[PDB]
Symmetry: D3
C-alpha cells in the first residue's frame, strides 16, 4: 500500500546512504509526508492504514537512534488524534503533511539554537576535538567560528565508515583550520585539546549517551585530562522508553563494511569481524548536553523526558494496528 | 662506501617493509654482519671506517624504537673494544660477524622465554585483547594456546597501517579464534576482556611504554575495568638514555599513510593530516612487563637498565667519530 | 490506650521478627489499621488521640528506614486532614482503615512494577550479585528469570544476621541458580559479576543510599570494575527531611547479635563490639535507582521527593498532637 | 544624573570596601532604593531613566557574582512591569522602594534558613575547614555552634586579600575555637577535617561553583579524602544566563593587591603578577549546595534556575534601553 | 617411609588446626626436623629419599602461602647441597636438623624486627584497623602499644573462620583496647581509622599481596579515604616463581566451613557455596611492606626476591628426586 | 668548646636567615670546616670532642631536611674512621677540613648534573609551574632556558615566608619570563601548565617527598590534569632512617612568622595559628625524581638509599659520645 518513495527513503536509511540521527529523523518524517501527498487510498480508514504501514517500515530501518522513532511518534501521533476525532480523508491528509513539515522545521531550528548555545562555551583560541559527523556538533563549532572566534578542530577518522572525512571537508569549507588524525591518536592529542564536542543518537534517562563507536573512549581520556566533553543533541535524541527500564540496542552492522567482501572472503574463517556502530558513554564523562532548550547536566536528561514525552508512557506506537 | 645490502636493508626499515621493534633490531644486526662479510676493505682502519658508516646509516632510519640502536650498540661496542685492542682485519671482522649472529640468536631466544613466562599469566577460557602487531605479544598468546589453554584474541585494526590484519591472519593460522574490531571498539569490548597483552618499541627508566599509536588508549580503559595490561618486551627495548633525562621522540610519518596521495591532493589546504606512529603509556596503566629475564613491575625498568646497559651511558655511541 | 496488636507489631519490628524496609512499612500501616479497626474509643477527639499514640509508638521502633515514618505519615496525614475538618467518629475510623489499605496495596503494586522495569535492565546470561535480603531486589531478579532470562545470582551472606540465607533460599525456590559467598569475597567475585542489584532503607535528596551494612563496600568495588549498581526502591524509601538538611540516623543494634552473649561474657572488658545496622553509599557509586515511577539517576531523588512529599515538610508529624 | 550615594556605593563595590556576593547584592538593592528615595525627577519617564542609569552603573562594578545582577533584576524587573503599566511617578517610586526592601529582607531571611538547614549536617565534635569569608558559610557554622554542637573551624588565610583574618576574627567572637593556616596547608590538615563548608559567588546550571580563588583546590583534596564539601549559597547565587551556554567570567583584579605598588615597581619588567579573584569547582567535587529552599545536589542547580528565573532568560535586562 | 609426626603436622596444616602463613612455615620446618631427627634410615641415599618424600607431602597441604614451600626449600636446599657433595649419613641428619633450627629461629627473629620497624610507623593516638589474624600485624601493633603509644585497634571478624576473634582476644590480652566489627563494616569505620595493618600469605614480584579473603576490600576503601595500608611480612612471604610469570593459586576450601553441613544438607541443589580462602590486593593499594629487612614500597618486592632467592629459580624443587 | 662561627651558622639556620635543604647542608659542612680551622684544642681526643659537639648543635637547628644530617654524616664519618685509626691532632684536622670541602663541592656539582638531566625533559615552548625556592628546581629550569628552550615559569607565592619572591626575582635575572600567582591559584592555571618542577627536603624510601608546605596540593591537582611533576633532589635528600620504619618529622615553626607579633597579640586568644613548614607528597603524584645520578621513578628511592647509605644502618650518628 506504501508508496515507492517511502521504500526508497527506508532503503537509503539502512544502507546509510542517508545517515546521522538528526537527518534520518527528518527523512523519516519526509517519508510520511510523501506517503500522504502521493497516497491513492480512496477511503480515510484505508489511508490511515497505509500510513501506519509506512511508519512501521521506517521504524525498522535502523534501531539505535531514537530520533527516528521520535520523529515517527510526532507525525503519527497528531495523525492519530485527528483520526479518532473524525478526520475526513483530505483532512488527515493535511494534518500529516503538516505535522511532517512542522517536525522537519523545528529540527532545522533546533540545530541553529544548539549552535548559538554551545558556541558561547567555545573560547577564542580554543582547540576542539570531535568524533564522527554530527550536524549538531558542527553547528556548535561552525557558529563559534562565525562569531569571530579563532579555533582549530581535531577531527578523528571514525572507522569503519571514515566519517571523519565528512567533518574534515565540511569544516574546512567554512574556513576553519582542521587537524585530521586516526582514532588511536585521541589520547595522544588530548593534552593539547581544550574542548570536546560530539553529537548523539540516543540519550538515556540517566544521562548515558549512545553515539558513534569510539565516543566512549574519547570521553574517557577527556575526563582523565580535565577537558570538557559537550554533547550537542536535540531533545528528540532522548530515549523515553529508557526511563521505563528499557535498554537501548547497539546496532551491529555487516562485516564487509569493515573489511571489503572481496578481501574478507580471502580471510581464515576462524577470524570473525564484529562491527558495532555505537557504544555507550557514561553520564560522568559528559559535562553538559547542549539542546535547543538550554545547556543541561547529563543527569538532567530525566527532566527533558518528562516535559517532552509525557505521551509515550500511556500508549503503544501510534502506528500499531 | 658501504655494502648494497646494507643501504637496501636500511631502506626497508624506512618504508616499513620491515617493521616491528624486534625484527628491525635483528635486521639492523644482520646488516652489520653483511657489511663485515662483504666488506672489501684491505686495511682494518678502513674496515672499521666502513662499519661505522653502516651503523650511522641504519641508526638514521627510524628514531623511536631503541631496539634498533641497542642492537647497533651491541655489535659496534664489541667492535670498538677489539679495534682499540689492535685487532687484525680478519679478527675485527670475526668479532663483528659473531656479535651480530649472537644478538640475532639471543633476540630469538628472548622471544621464546618471554613466551613461556607470559603464558603462565593467561588462564584457560581467557579473552585477550591486543593492539598492533607484536612478535613478542604473539609469543605469549601462541604459547598459551599450545599448553592447551582455550583462548580468544580480540585484535584491534590498528590504523593507519592495518597492522591488525597481520596479527589476525597470523594468530588464526595457529588455530586461535579471532575477533577483529576497529580501534574505536576498544572500550566497547573491554568489559568482556580478561587480559590485555601488547608489545613495545621503547621503555623509559620510570616504566613508561612507547608503543604503537593507540596503545595508551587501550591501556587507559583497561585500568578503568581492572583488566591486567601486560607488555611483552625484550630487555633491549628498554631505553638507556632515558635515565639521563632524555625524552623518547615520537616519529611523525608521512600523511599519505593515513590518506592516500591520490585522494589527499584533493583535500583543501586548510586540512592537515597528523600521523604519530606511537604514543606513551604511563607506568601506572602497565601492570607488568614480560622480559626474557622474567616478569617485573613497570617501576623496575631502572633495574633492567642498570643491569644490561650499565656502561651504555657515558661511552659515546661506539659508531661515532 | 492503644490496642494490643499495635504494641506487638511494634515489638516484632524492634527485634526484627519482621524486617525489610518495605515489609516494615506495611506492617506499620496494618497496625494503624488494627488500632482504628479494633479500637473502642467512645469519642472522636479521643480516637484521634489513641492514633497519634499508636503512630508515635511505631515510629519509635527502628529509625533508619523512612519507609516506616513514611507509611505512618500516609495514613495519619489523611486522618488529620479529615479530623481537623470535622470528622465524625466513624468517618475517621473509615478514613484510616482505608489509607492503611491503600498504602499496603500500593506497596504490593510498587514491587510488581519495580520488578518489571528493573528486569528490562537484566540481560540474558547476566550474573547478578546482591546483598542482604530485599524484596525490591529479589523482585527485579525473580521477574528477569521468569521472562526467560537465564541468570545466576551471587548472594552475599550479609552478617551479622545471615540475611543472605533468606535470599539464597528464596531465589533458589524460584529455580534461580545461586552462588553463596562471604561478605569479604565481594571484590574477589566482582570480576565475574555483570550487574549488582540491591534494595534500600532510605534514599537522600542528593541520592545517597542507606542500605544494610556492607552495601557501600560492594558499591565501591563495583564502580572499580565498572559494573552497574542498581538500587531498587519504592518512592516511600526516599527521605523527605533529608531535604531540609537532616541526616539519616544509622541504627546501632545490640552487640549480642554479632557475638552470642553466652560467649560475649567470656570476653575481656577492653574488647567492645560495635554493630552498625547500615552504612552510606554515595550517589557516585549508584548508577540508577529503580522505582515504581521508572528508572532515575541517583541525583533525581529530589524529583521524587518534591513530587510525592511536597505537603509533609511545612507541617509537623501528624501524630504529634 | 544619578544620586551621589549610588556612585559612592558603586565605588565601594569596586574597591571591595564592600564585598561578599550577598552583601554586594544587598548593597546593590539598597542603592536602587536610595536612588528612588532621593531622586528629584519631577516626571516618571525621567525617573525611570534615572533608575536604569543607576542599575547600569551598579551592574558594571564587578562581573563575577550573579547575586549582583540578580538583585538588580529583582528590583528593576518589577519596576519595568509597573512602568509599562503606566505607573505614576510616586507609584513607580513605591514599586521600587518595596522591591529593594523586599530583596534585602529576603536575603537576610535566606541567610537564616541556609543556617538551620546546613547546621543539621554538622555533628558534635566536627572539625570544619572553610575558605575565604562567606556570610552564608558562617551562618551554617554559627548555627551549629548554637545548638550546643562543640566544633572547631580551620580557617584558611585566603590570599591575596587576607579574607581568612575576617572569618577567624568573626567566628572567634561567637566563641568557636579557630585554627588559622595558610592556603597551602589545605591538604596537610585535610586528613583531620570532617566537613568542608564554603560559600559561592555564582553557580552554573550544571552545578559548577564559582567561588573565591583557591576554593577548587580545597574541594579537590576534599574529595580525595572523602570529606563532604558543602556550599552554602542563596538561590540568587545561581546563574540564569549559564543555561544559555554563557560562561561565567573570572574577574582579574589589579596586581597591586597581591604585591604592593611600592614593592611591585621594584620588580623587573619580565615578571607578571596574575590575580584571578575566583576559580571554578567542578560539580563532582561539590557534595551539596545548601539553599534557603533546602538542600540539593549540584546537578539540580537547573531546577533552581527553571524555578526562580523561569523568565530571566528572554526578557532582556530590565535596565537596558 | 616418613615418620608419624610429619604426616600429622601435615594433617593439622590441611585442617587449619595450625594456621597463619608464618606459623605454618615453621611447623613445616619443625616437621622436616622430626623426620631427620626420628628417622631410622640405615643408608644415606635412602634418608635423602624419605626427606624428599616428607617434604613433598608437606608441600601438598595448602597452596596459597609461599612461606610453606619457602621454609621447605630452605631446609631441603641445604640438604641437597650437602648430599650431592658426598654427605655421610649422619652429616646430612645434622645439616637438616640444623637448617630447620635456623629457619624457625630466623622466623621468630624476623617478627621481632618487623614489629620494631612497623611500630615506628604507628603514632600515639592512632586507631589501627586490621583483618584476619596475623602474627606480623599483631607484632607491629603489640610493639607500638608497649612503646607507650596509646592505640585502639578495630578488628574485623573475618569470616568464615571467625579469625577476628583470635585477634581481638590476643590484642586484648596485651591491654590494647579493641573494637570488634563485621567484615562488611570496613568502609563504615574507615573514616575513623588512621592506619591499616595486615599480614600476608604470599607477595608477588610486582608487589601484589595475597592475604585472607576480604583483604583487597579493606585495601580498596583505605586508598579511598587516603589511609596508609601497611602489609607486615617476613622475606619468606615473597613468591619466587612469581617472577618467572607463575600465578599464585587461591585455595578453595570446603563449603561446610561457611555453612555447617548439618544445615547445608537442608539447602536446595541449585544453591552452591564457594569459599575462596584469599583474594588479591593490587600494589597500588599497598603503601608499604614491613619486612625484617626494612620498609619497602610494594614495587620493591623484586629487590627482596632477587636478594633472597637468586639461587632457587634455575634449580628444581630440591625435594623432587 | 665550639668556635663562635659555628654558633652563628647554627643560629642563621634556625632563623632561616640561611635556608633551603641544599644550602643548609653545605653551611652545616662549612660549620664543621671552620670549627677545624679555628679549633684551639691542643690534644686530638679533645679536638674530636669539640667536633662532635659542634655537629650535635648543627643537627638540632632544623629537623625536617635530611640534607643537614647527611652532610653531618659525611664529614663526621670520615673524621671518625680517621680517629679510630690513630689520627694525630693535625691529621684529623685536615681529614675534616677535607671531607668538608669534598661535600660542599659535590653539592655544587650535583646541582649542575641535576640541571643537565632535568633540562632534557623540558621542551621548547613549555610552561613550568614550581613552588617555593629550590636551587635544584631552578637548576633544571635555568639550564633548559640556556639550552635555548623557550619557557615561561609560573611561580607560586609560597606563604608564609613569601619564598616565591626569591624564585621570581632570581628566574627573571636569567632572562626567563615569569608569572607570579597566589598559592590558591595553582589549580586555576594547572590547565595551562606543561610541567611541574619542585625540589625536596627529605625523600622517604617508598618515594614520599617532603617539601615546602603546599607541594602536596600542587602535585594532587597536577596528577588530576595529567601534568608531569618532577622533583629535583640530590641523593643526600633521601632519608636512610626512613627505610627502618622511621617517620620524617614535619617541623612546626613560630606563629608570628605567619601573622606578625604586633598584629597577632591583637587577636582573640581562642584563635590559634598553626604553621607547618612542609607537607608530604605521595609517590604516586610524583612522576620522576631528578638526582645527580639519573632520572628515577619515585619507588626507586629505595635503590638510592642502599647504594649511598649502607653505612647508617650499622651505627649511631658519628657524633654521639
Ligand atoms: O544527528 P547528528 O547530529 O547529525 O549526528 C548524531 C550522531 O548520529 C550519527 O550516527 P550515524 O552516522 O547515523 O550512524 C553519528 O554517530 C553522530 O554523532
Ligand atoms: O618487537 P615486536 O615485539 O615484534 O613489536 C614491538 C612493536 O614495534 C611495532 O612498531 P612498528 O610496527 O615497527 O612501527 C609495534 O608497535 C609493536 O608493538
Ligand atoms: O524493602 P526491602 O526491599 O524488602 O528491603 C530493603 C532493605 O531493608 C533491609 O534492612 P533491614 O533488614 O530491615 O534492617 C535490608 O537492608 C534491605 O536491603
Ligand atoms: O555571599 P557570601 O555568602 O557572604 O560569600 C560569598 C562569596 O563572595 C566572596 O567573594 P568576594 O569577597 O566578594 O570577592 C567570597 O568568595 C565568598 O565565598
Ligand atoms: O604469618 P602471619 O602473619 O602469622 O599470618 C599471615 C596470613 O596467613 C593467614 O592465612 P591463613 O589463616 O593461614 O589461611 C592470614 O591470612 C594472615 O593474614
Ligand atoms: O635544597 P633546595 O633545592 O635549594 O630547596 C629544597 C627545598 O628546601 C626548602 O625548604 P626550606 O626553605 O629550607 O625550609 C624548600 O622547601 C625547597 O623546596
Ligand atoms: Cl558506522
Ligand atoms: Cl615485517
Ligand atoms: Cl542486621
Ligand atoms: Cl564588607
Ligand atoms: Cl579462612
Ligand atoms: Cl616556611
Ligand atoms: Mg592542557
Ligand atoms: Mg531534575
Ligand atoms: Mg629497585
Amino acid at each position: 500500500a506504501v508508496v515507492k518513495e517511502v521504500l526508497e527513503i527506508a532503503e537509503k536509511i539502512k544502507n546509510m546512504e542517508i545517515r546521522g540521527a538528526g537527518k534520518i529523523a527528518r527523512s523519516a518524517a519526509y517519508a510520511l509526508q510523501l506517503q500522504a501527498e502521493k497516497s491513492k487510498a480512496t477511503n480515510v480508514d484505508e489511508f490511515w492504514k497505509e500510513m501506519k504501514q509506512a511508519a512501521k517500515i521506517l521504524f525498522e530501518t535502523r534501531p539505535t537512534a531514537v530520533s527516528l522513532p521520535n520523529a515517527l511518534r510526532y507525525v503519527m501521533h497528531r495523525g492519530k488524534i485527528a483520526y479518532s476525532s473524525g478526520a475526513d480523508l483530505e483532512q488527515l491528509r493535511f494534518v500529516i503533511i503538516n505535522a511532517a513539515k512542522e517536525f522537519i522545521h523545528n529540527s532545522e531550528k533546533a540545530l541553529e539554537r544548539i549552535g548559538e548555545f554551545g558556541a558561547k562555551r567555545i573560547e577564542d583560541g580554543d582547540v576542539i576535538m570531535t568524533h564522527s559527523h554530527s550536524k549538531a556538533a558542527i553547528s556548535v563549532m561552525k557558529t563559534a567560528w562565525e562569531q569571530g572566534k579563532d579555533i582549530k578542530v581535531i577531527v578523528t577518522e571514525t572507522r569503519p565508515k571514515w566519517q571523519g572525512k565528512i567533518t574534515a571537508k565540511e569544516l574546512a569549507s567554512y574556513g576553519i583550520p582542521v587537524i585530521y588524525v586516526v582514532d588511536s591518536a585521541a589520547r595522544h592529542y588530548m593534552k593539547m585539546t581544550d574542548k570536546v564536542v560530539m553529537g548523539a543518537d540516543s540519550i538515556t534517562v540517566n544521562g548515558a549517551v549512545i553515539n558513534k563507536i569510539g565516543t566512549a573512549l574519547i570521553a574517557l581520556t577527556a575526563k582523565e585530562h580535565r577537558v570538557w566533553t559537550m554533547i550537542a543533541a536535540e531533545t528528540y535524541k532522548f530515549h523515553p522508553e529508557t526511563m521505563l527500564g528499557q535498554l537501548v540496542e547497539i546496532e551491529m552492522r555487516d562485516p564487509t563494511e569493515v573489511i571489503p567482501e572481496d578481501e574478507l572472503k580471502t580471510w581464515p574463517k576462524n577470524i570473525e569481524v564484529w562491527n558495532p556502530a555505537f557504544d555507550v558513554t557514561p553520564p560522568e564523562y559528559v559535562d553538559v548536553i547542549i539542546t535547543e532548550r538550554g545547556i543541561i547536566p547529563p543527569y538532567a536528561a530525566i527532566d527533558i523526558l518528562r516535559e517532552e514525552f509525557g505521551w509515550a508512557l500511556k500508549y503503544t506506537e501510534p502506528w500499531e494496528d
